[PDB]
Design an enzyme around this catalytic site. Structure first.
Site, PDB file in Angstrom:
ATOM      1  N   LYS A 225     -16.761  -5.973  -6.825  1.00  0.00           N
ATOM      2  CA  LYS A 225     -16.029  -6.848  -7.739  1.00  0.00           C
ATOM      3  C   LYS A 225     -15.406  -8.034  -7.007  1.00  0.00           C
ATOM      4  O   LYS A 225     -15.472  -9.174  -7.485  1.00  0.00           O
ATOM      5  CB  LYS A 225     -14.958  -6.051  -8.479  1.00  0.00           C
ATOM      6  CG  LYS A 225     -14.578  -6.640  -9.817  1.00  0.00           C
ATOM      7  CD  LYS A 225     -13.757  -5.671 -10.634  1.00  0.00           C
ATOM      8  CE  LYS A 225     -13.537  -6.194 -12.038  1.00  0.00           C
ATOM      9  NZ  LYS A 225     -13.012  -5.138 -12.943  1.00  0.00           N
ATOM     10  N   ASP A 226     -14.828  -7.797  -5.828  1.00  0.00           N
ATOM     11  CA  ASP A 226     -14.279  -8.895  -5.046  1.00  0.00           C
ATOM     12  C   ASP A 226     -15.377  -9.745  -4.424  1.00  0.00           C
ATOM     13  O   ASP A 226     -15.173 -10.942  -4.213  1.00  0.00           O
ATOM     14  CB  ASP A 226     -13.337  -8.349  -3.977  1.00  0.00           C
ATOM     15  CG  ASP A 226     -12.080  -7.734  -4.570  1.00  0.00           C
ATOM     16  OD1 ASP A 226     -12.042  -7.523  -5.799  1.00  0.00           O
ATOM     17  OD2 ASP A 226     -11.136  -7.444  -3.809  1.00  0.00           O
TER      18      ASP A 226
ATOM     19  N   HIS B 299       0.800  -1.221   0.000  1.00  0.00           N
ATOM     20  CA  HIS B 299       0.000   0.000   0.000  1.00  0.00           C
ATOM     21  C   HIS B 299       0.835   1.275   0.000  1.00  0.00           C
ATOM     22  O   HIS B 299       0.263   2.363  -0.109  1.00  0.00           O
ATOM     23  CB  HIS B 299      -0.942   0.029   1.201  1.00  0.00           C
ATOM     24  CG  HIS B 299      -2.085  -0.927   1.087  1.00  0.00           C
ATOM     25  ND1 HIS B 299      -2.804  -1.095  -0.075  1.00  0.00           N
ATOM     26  CD2 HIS B 299      -2.673  -1.722   2.011  1.00  0.00           C
ATOM     27  CE1 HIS B 299      -3.746  -2.000   0.121  1.00  0.00           C
ATOM     28  NE2 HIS B 299      -3.702  -2.380   1.384  1.00  0.00           N
TER      29      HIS B 299
ATOM     30  N   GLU C 102       0.557 -34.435  -3.199  1.00  0.00           N
ATOM     31  CA  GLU C 102      -0.599 -33.836  -3.844  1.00  0.00           C
ATOM     32  C   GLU C 102      -0.169 -33.093  -5.108  1.00  0.00           C
ATOM     33  O   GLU C 102       1.021 -32.881  -5.360  1.00  0.00           O
ATOM     34  CB  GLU C 102      -1.329 -32.907  -2.882  1.00  0.00           C
ATOM     35  CG  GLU C 102      -2.152 -33.637  -1.843  1.00  0.00           C
ATOM     36  CD  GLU C 102      -3.367 -34.319  -2.445  1.00  0.00           C
ATOM     37  OE1 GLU C 102      -3.953 -33.763  -3.397  1.00  0.00           O
ATOM     38  OE2 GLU C 102      -3.739 -35.412  -1.969  1.00  0.00           O
TER      39      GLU C 102
ATOM     40  N   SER D 131      -1.424  -0.440  -6.419  1.00  0.00           N
ATOM     41  CA  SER D 131      -1.486  -1.624  -7.253  1.00  0.00           C
ATOM     42  C   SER D 131      -0.922  -1.340  -8.638  1.00  0.00           C
ATOM     43  O   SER D 131      -0.762  -0.190  -9.054  1.00  0.00           O
ATOM     44  CB  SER D 131      -2.925  -2.112  -7.378  1.00  0.00           C
ATOM     45  OG  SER D 131      -3.575  -2.090  -6.122  1.00  0.00           O
TER      46      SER D 131
HETATM   47  C1  HEM Z   1      -0.356 -16.354   1.071  1.00  0.00           C
HETATM   48  C2  HEM Z   1      -0.979 -16.067  -0.061  1.00  0.00           C
HETATM   49  C3  HEM Z   1      -1.061 -14.678  -0.531  1.00  0.00           C
HETATM   50  C4  HEM Z   1      -1.945 -13.744  -0.114  1.00  0.00           C
HETATM   51  C5  HEM Z   1      -3.016 -13.909   0.927  1.00  0.00           C
HETATM   52  C6  HEM Z   1      -1.672 -12.568  -0.835  1.00  0.00           C
HETATM   53  C7  HEM Z   1      -2.437 -11.432  -0.614  1.00  0.00           C
HETATM   54  C8  HEM Z   1      -2.379 -10.380  -1.485  1.00  0.00           C
HETATM   55  C9  HEM Z   1      -3.279  -9.314  -1.516  1.00  0.00           C
HETATM   56  C10 HEM Z   1      -4.466  -9.149  -0.608  1.00  0.00           C
HETATM   57  C11 HEM Z   1      -2.878  -8.483  -2.505  1.00  0.00           C
HETATM   58  C12 HEM Z   1      -3.569  -7.209  -2.888  1.00  0.00           C
HETATM   59  C13 HEM Z   1      -4.693  -7.514  -3.884  1.00  0.00           C
HETATM   60  C14 HEM Z   1      -4.134  -7.766  -5.256  1.00  0.00           C
HETATM   61  O1  HEM Z   1      -3.547  -6.883  -5.829  1.00  0.00           O
HETATM   62  O2  HEM Z   1      -4.282  -8.959  -5.844  1.00  0.00           O
HETATM   63  C15 HEM Z   1      -1.718  -9.025  -3.098  1.00  0.00           C
HETATM   64  C16 HEM Z   1      -1.017  -8.432  -4.130  1.00  0.00           C
HETATM   65  C17 HEM Z   1       0.237  -8.869  -4.546  1.00  0.00           C
HETATM   66  N1  HEM Z   1       0.847 -10.004  -4.189  1.00  0.00           N
HETATM   67 FE1  HEM Z   1       0.108 -11.364  -2.924  1.00  0.00          FE
HETATM   68  N2  HEM Z   1      -0.650 -12.753  -1.680  1.00  0.00           N
HETATM   69  C18 HEM Z   1      -0.227 -14.017  -1.559  1.00  0.00           C
HETATM   70  C19 HEM Z   1       0.791 -14.671  -2.242  1.00  0.00           C
HETATM   71  C20 HEM Z   1       1.685 -13.966  -3.018  1.00  0.00           C
HETATM   72  C21 HEM Z   1       2.844 -14.497  -3.566  1.00  0.00           C
HETATM   73  C22 HEM Z   1       3.273 -15.929  -3.393  1.00  0.00           C
HETATM   74  C23 HEM Z   1       3.463 -13.479  -4.272  1.00  0.00           C
HETATM   75  C24 HEM Z   1       4.737 -13.548  -5.007  1.00  0.00           C
HETATM   76  C25 HEM Z   1       4.885 -14.294  -6.092  1.00  0.00           C
HETATM   77  C26 HEM Z   1       2.649 -12.320  -4.142  1.00  0.00           C
HETATM   78  C27 HEM Z   1       2.959 -11.107  -4.706  1.00  0.00           C
HETATM   79  C28 HEM Z   1       2.021 -10.087  -4.794  1.00  0.00           C
HETATM   80  C29 HEM Z   1       2.211  -8.907  -5.620  1.00  0.00           C
HETATM   81  C30 HEM Z   1       3.421  -8.632  -6.458  1.00  0.00           C
HETATM   82  C31 HEM Z   1       1.112  -8.143  -5.482  1.00  0.00           C
HETATM   83  C32 HEM Z   1       0.895  -6.809  -6.155  1.00  0.00           C
HETATM   84  C33 HEM Z   1      -0.222  -6.812  -7.194  1.00  0.00           C
HETATM   85  C34 HEM Z   1       0.049  -5.793  -8.265  1.00  0.00           C
HETATM   86  O3  HEM Z   1       0.140  -4.496  -7.956  1.00  0.00           O
HETATM   87  O4  HEM Z   1       0.178  -6.152  -9.408  1.00  0.00           O
HETATM   88  N3  HEM Z   1       1.563 -12.656  -3.374  1.00  0.00           N
HETATM   89  N4  HEM Z   1      -1.433 -10.196  -2.444  1.00  0.00           N
END
Ligand code: HEM
Ligand SMILES: CCCCCCCCCCCCCCCCCC(=O)OC[C@H](COP(=O)([O-])OCC[N+](C)(C)C)OC(=O)CCCCCCCCCCCCCCCCC
Ligand SMILES: CCCCCCCCCCCCCCCCCC(=O)OC[C@H](COP(=O)([O-])OCC[N+](C)(C)C)OC(=O)CCCCCCCCCCCCCCCCC
Ligand SMILES: CCCCCCCCCCCCCCCCCC(=O)OC[C@H](COP(=O)(O)OCCN)OC(=O)CCCCCCCCCCCCCCCCC
Ligand SMILES: CCCCCCCCCCCCCCCCCC(=O)OC[C@H](COP(=O)(O)OCCN)OC(=O)CCCCCCCCCCCCCCCCC
Ligand SMILES: CCCCCCCCCCCCCCCCCC(=O)OC[C@H](COP(=O)(O)OCCN)OC(=O)CCCCCCCCCCCCCCCCC
Ligand code: HEM
Lengths: 58, 48, 102, 57, 52, 49, 379, 87
Positions: free
Chosen positions: G226-227, G200, G270, G204
């Site tokens: 949307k979500d 944040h 799995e 995004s």
């Molecule tokens: C434990 C599971 C995960 C949760 C709960 C999680 C949660 C979130 C949430 C709530 C957001 C903001 C909403 C969105 O933009 O989609 C987000 C964005 C993001 N997450 Fe995760 N995430 C997870 C796994 C990961 C993993 C494994 C990566 C790395 C590969 C990652 C990298 C990112 C990135 C780079 C964003 C930025 C989105 C953008 O601006 O393009 N996340 N994540």
């Protein structure tokens, strides 16, 4: 005086009346939807469920 | 192996009917609250 | 280089697809410190044109639409407005880095 | 000197002489009228909201 | 120490907010008897008496 | 006509002309903190009535 | 005056979900991120209702799970949504990482690294949860993958005796795996809080990759509904996967009790581990296989330093788009090969698949980026 | 089509007594008349897709609605007299 104006006015306009509408509709929808889905399920499985063959074994 | 089989299929039938009711309505809410933005027009006024 | 490289450049310009959002080439560049400084050094007319083109592209990609084909940015009419500013910023950064080396 | 029609209530309010009786300014020449461009070609029709149809007539 | 609200204006506010708070209480009671499947009131209603 | 106005008919008229109505919003200046039409439209009714 | 901006608890919710500026053009893929959080809550909630009846003892674990299914009211429902919610969690996780790779979201390096920490934590949590029901496949998969984790000389054997709590997998391993499986989702939830906090500060990303500050909208009411719609679609998929095909993704060999002398003809994890498994056995050396698994999962961490284009997204890069879809195809082939036994012709297909996977991520995508840079007359 | 279905799945024919004769003859002319009404509605629909009916002079659909309300009230009379009462 038309029907959509009065349906908005005395049911949808106020938020508390909106919530009362939602609660009463939820109760009646539960009863009608349970009856409909139970009737569909017993028609698809006609003669197969236990209640269809319960009368044979008293 | 599955004593819950018939109850599972009945609950799945209720799930399918409820989801088939709920998905177009929630999609309609999304289309309403986003149709304020999807009909938007932008203009540009360069002063030259 | 004479016959088809320019033709392959035109075909690749059509294929990459930022022309059908109305964008120029230098609008598509990802910001760094160098690109942000080069954008900061732009005059007001080109800055306002760039920001309007960017938000028009974001509007078009919201609705999953593209511009009409006559409003696609032409390959020859595509001006490289930013890259002298970017090249000057890169040159002065390289001068600062080579002074910091010695 | 005395009254100018304004004030969002549609009323002849009181205003100074330099704006009640001289509403056009002392600037000599009008400079330009910058045109409006749109993203898509829009059918910005003032009268009767462009056209109303559903096919070929 | 609640003597700041002893006047005609707060009484006016109170009689303005009788029907809305009463309707919200009705919503809460109907939702409570709907969610709990309480047998006192749900036997007094015609159509919902089908599973009993 | 002014003497006819009391509080009950005034809030009835104000609910008739303001409550749950779509406004027309015009803005000019640095107005990105001015919200979208959805939040302005949602602010025109109370969830508590 | 208002509580939304001045109350110290509602200020956080307003800053993160209500008046948060978000790009106006983000597609449905971004919804996957919120879906992941929802899955986490779902898993935690369902996990708690499995913990009110589960008995972590090797005599009474399989029996306790059968008692959950057969005697607990709706216990079959909770167990099968926990299993298929783990599967849906990994589906949403994979698509989240694919969104991060495609649209250049790894340039948020702190967010990317907290992400790969979250990915490691959820893989370990799903591993120990799969050990928990104490069937044939749980016992034998745990024994196989921990014994190959023991391959490090002079260090790995003491580490595997410490992990097992004994000579092999036994009741101590089952109980400590229960404790670790319960406690790891809360570190996962805290790390997701840190993930969102690191996001944040910058906002995004958008599919075009450009600066979306020219056109941003509040999170409420747009991305709220949307979500919500994405949550409803996910719950359709999950409840279809529970109420209609409850063991299509599962493995039948987990339904026998754990006999320590009954080695199954095939031993698999799995499906969401399987690709790494096929990178594991693609090298005929145990140190090489385990270290190659570590690189195959940490090449995501190496990814932000392998970016060469002056652009960010792949929306205007067709060659790197082709290489990305070849990479996804190769990942699908690796999953299928890891499902398959170690015979002809699966060994050579798996070897070429892992070689092409590492070659595409490491070598071919920066080459494609510099080729497209030269092709666009900027280099 | 589902009137044709109940023609297919009835327990008696037009030669099966005076009840069969009366019921099948009345329902047969009702089916013929509702076929005429459906064809007339098809004709006025195809006319309106060619932009024929204006806001006032649209007598084709007025005749269609009158014939259709006739078919409706006649079917109500068959429902009462033949189906519900007397059977
Ligand atoms: C434990 C599971 C995960 C949760 C709960 C999680 C949660 C979130 C949430 C709530 C957001 C903001 C909403 C969105 O933009 O989609 C987000 C964005 C993001 N997450 Fe995760 N995430 C997870 C796994 C990961 C993993 C494994 C990566 C790395 C590969 C990652 C990298 C990112 C990135 C780079 C964003 C930025 C989105 C953008 O601006 O393009 N996340 N994540
Ligand atoms: C998930 C779908 C619903 C999401 C929330 C929502 O739209 O709520 C409707 C609305 C907000 O949606 P809205 O934005 O369409 O507002 C409706 C506007 N008025 C009130 C003027 C008609 O929220 C409420 O009405 C308050 C929430 C409670 C609803 C009633 C619950 C009754 C049962 C209690 C047990
Ligand atoms: C000259 C006199 C003129 C006026 C006469 C006035 C009265 C005429 C007679 C009226 C009908 C009398 C019997 C009706 C009740 C039958 C009860 C019965 O057998 O129920 C069990 C049977 C069998 O039970 P079931 O369990 O198979 O039903 C399915 C139940 N659900 C829907 C929940 C899945 O049920 C019915 O017959 C239900 C009939 C429902 C439909 C009724 C009409 C709906 C509206 C049609 C017109 C819409 C216009 C727009
Ligand atoms: C299958 C769906 C394919 C698809 O829809 O592809 C099109 C889309 C690319 O479209 P885009 O360039 O954004 O342009 C918008 C208008 N077409 O494609 C996309 O938006 C796809 C973006 C990536 C999301 C899918 C990820 C798939 C799984 C990746 C697994 C590997 C991740 C790393 C694992 C280690
Ligand atoms: C010069 C090309 C001209 C194409 C003309 C097509 C018809 C044009 C007129 C009709 C319009 C059709 C729709 C237009 C779509 C967009 C424009 C287009 O056609 O683009 C061509 C597309 C992308 O273009 P570009 O990136 O330049 O191609 C490089 C080729 N590699 O490139 C392609 O489609 C080619 C993609 C080839 C991919 C081959 C992959 C092979 C390897 C897969 C391995 C997978 C893993 C296997 C297992 C490994 C381990 C064993
Ligand atoms: C049984 C046979 C008799 C069935 C009933 C016929 C009723 C005819 C009523 C009068 C029709 C008529 O002349 O209407 C006037 C109308 C022109 O006026 P209008 O179109 O409103 O004004 C111009 C608008 N710009 O002119 C028209 O609308 C002309 C077209 C109307 C006639 C359409 C005919 C449809 C026939 C359907 C049954 C076919 C029977 C054979 C096939 C089925 C056999 C089972
Ligand atoms: C704190 C939260 C959690 C608790 C208390 C918990 C608890 C449990 C328990 C008691 C079991 C064994 C019961 C059974 O097998 O049906 C189990 C199984 C399992 N859990 Fe969890 N769990 C939690 C979170 C998670 C998460 C986040 C995942 C996903 C990564 C997960 C994945 C699994 C899997 C795959 C199984 C095996 C299902 C099977 O029997 O096939 N759990 N969990």
């Amino acid at each position: 005086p038309t029907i959509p104006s009065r349906l908005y006015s005395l049911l949808f306009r106020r938020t508390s009346t909106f919530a009362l509408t939602i609660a009463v509709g939820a109760l009646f929808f539960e009863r009608a939807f349970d009856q409909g889905a139970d009737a569909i399920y017993e028609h698809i499985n006609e003669g197969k469920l236990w209640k269809h063959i319960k009368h044979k074994y008293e | 192996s599955e004593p819950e089989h018939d109850h599972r299929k009945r609950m799945g039938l209720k799930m399918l009917l409820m989801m088939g009711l709920l998905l177009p309505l929630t999609y309609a809410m999304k289309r309403h609250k986003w149709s304020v933005l999807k009909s938007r027009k932008l203009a540009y006024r360069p002063p030259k | 280089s004479s016959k088809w490289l320019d033709g392959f450049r035109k075909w690749y310009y059509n294929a990459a697809g930022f022309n059908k959002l109305g964008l120029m080439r230098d609008d598509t560049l990802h910001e760094t410190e160098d690109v942000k400084e080069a954008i900061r050094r732009l005059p007001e007319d080109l800055y306002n044109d760039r920001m309007f083109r960017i938000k028009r592209a974001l509007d078009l990609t919201m609705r999953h639409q593209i511009l009409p084909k006559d409003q696609w940015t032409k390959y020859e009419e595509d001006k490289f407005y930013l890259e002298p500013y970017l090249k000057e910023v890169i040159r002065e950064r390289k001068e600062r880095e080579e002074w910091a080396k010695k | 000197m005395y009254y100018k029609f304004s004030s969002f209530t549609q009323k002849l309010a009181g205003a100074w002489a330099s704006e009640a009786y001289t509403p056009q300014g002392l600037k000599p020449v009008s400079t330009e009228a910058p045109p409006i461009i749109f993203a898509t070609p829009t059918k910005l029709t003032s009268s009767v909201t462009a056209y109303d149809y559903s096919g070929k007539n | 120490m609640l003597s700041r609200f002893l006047g005609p204006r707060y009484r006016e506010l109170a009689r303005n907010w009788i029907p809305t708070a009463g309707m919200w209480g009705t919503v809460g009671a109907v939702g409570l008897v709907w969610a709990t499947d309480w047998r006192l009131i749900l036997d007094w209603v015609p159509y919902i008496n089908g599973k009993f | 006509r002014i003497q006819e106005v009391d509080a009950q008919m005034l809030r009835d008229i104000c609910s008739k002309y303001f409550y749950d109505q779509c406004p027309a919003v015009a803005g000019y200046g640095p107005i990105e903190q001015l919200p979208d039409y959805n939040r302005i439209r949602s602010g025109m009714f109370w969830l508590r009535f | 005056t208002n509580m939304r901006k001045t109350h110290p608890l509602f200020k956080i919710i307003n800053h993160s979900f209500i008046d948060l500026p978000a790009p106006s053009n983000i597609s449905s893929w971004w919804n996957f991120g919120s879906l992941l959080g929802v899955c986490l809550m779902v898993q935690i909630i369902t996990g708690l209702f499995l913990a009110m009846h589960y008995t972590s003892d090797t005599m009474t674990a399989f029996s306790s799970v059968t008692h959950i299914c057969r005697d607990v009211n709706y216990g079959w429902l909770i167990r099968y949504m926990h299993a298929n919610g783990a599967s849906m969690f990994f589906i949403c996780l994979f698509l989240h990482v694919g969104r991060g790779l495609y649209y250049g979201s790894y340039t948020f390096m702190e967010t990317w690294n907290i992400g790969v920490l979250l990915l490691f934590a959820v893989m370990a949590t799903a591993f120990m949860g799969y050990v928990l029901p104490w069937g044939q496949m749980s016992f034998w998969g745990a024994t196989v993958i921990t014994n190959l984790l023991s391959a490090i000389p002079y260090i790995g054997t003491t580490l595997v005796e410490w992990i097992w709590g004994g000579f092999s997998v036994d009741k101590a391993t089952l109980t400590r795996f229960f404790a670790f499986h319960f406690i790891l989702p809360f570190i996962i939830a805290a790390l997701a809080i840190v993930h969102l906090l690191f996001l944040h500060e910058t906002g995004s990303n958008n599919p075009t990759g450009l600066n979306s500050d020219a056109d941003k909208i509040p999170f409420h009411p747009y991305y709220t509904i949307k979500d919500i719609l994405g949550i409803l679609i996910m719950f359709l998929i999950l409840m279809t996967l529970v109420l209609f095909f409850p063991d299509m993704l599962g493995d039948p060999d987990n339904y026998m009790p754990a006999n320590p002398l009954n080695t199954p003809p095939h031993i698999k994890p799995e499906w969401y581990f399987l690709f790494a498994y096929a990178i594991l056995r693609s090298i005929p050396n145990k140190l090489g296989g385990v270290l190659a698994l570590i690189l195959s999962i940490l090449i995501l961490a190496l990814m932000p330093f392998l970016h060469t284009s002056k652009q960010r997204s792949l929306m205007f890069r067709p060659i790197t788009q082709i290489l990305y879809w070849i990479l996804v195809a190769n990942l699908l082939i690796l999953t299928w090969i890891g499902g398959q036994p170690v015979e002809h012709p699966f060994i050579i297909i798996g070897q070429l698949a892992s070689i092409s996977y590492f070659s595409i991520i490491l070598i071919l995508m920066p080459i494609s980026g510099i080729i497209e840079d030269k092709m666009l007359k900027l280099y | 089509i589902l009137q044709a279905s109940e023609y297919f799945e009835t327990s008696f024919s037009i030669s099966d007594g005076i009840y069969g004769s009366t019921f099948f003859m009345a329902t047969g002319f009702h089916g013929l008349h509702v076929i005429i009404g459906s064809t007339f509605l098809i004709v006025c629909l195809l006319r309106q897709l060619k932009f024929h009916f204006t806001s006032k002079h649209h007598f084709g659909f007025e005749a269609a609605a009158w014939y259709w309300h006739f078919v409706d009230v006649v079917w109500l009379f068959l429902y009462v007299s033949i189906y519900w009462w007397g059977s």
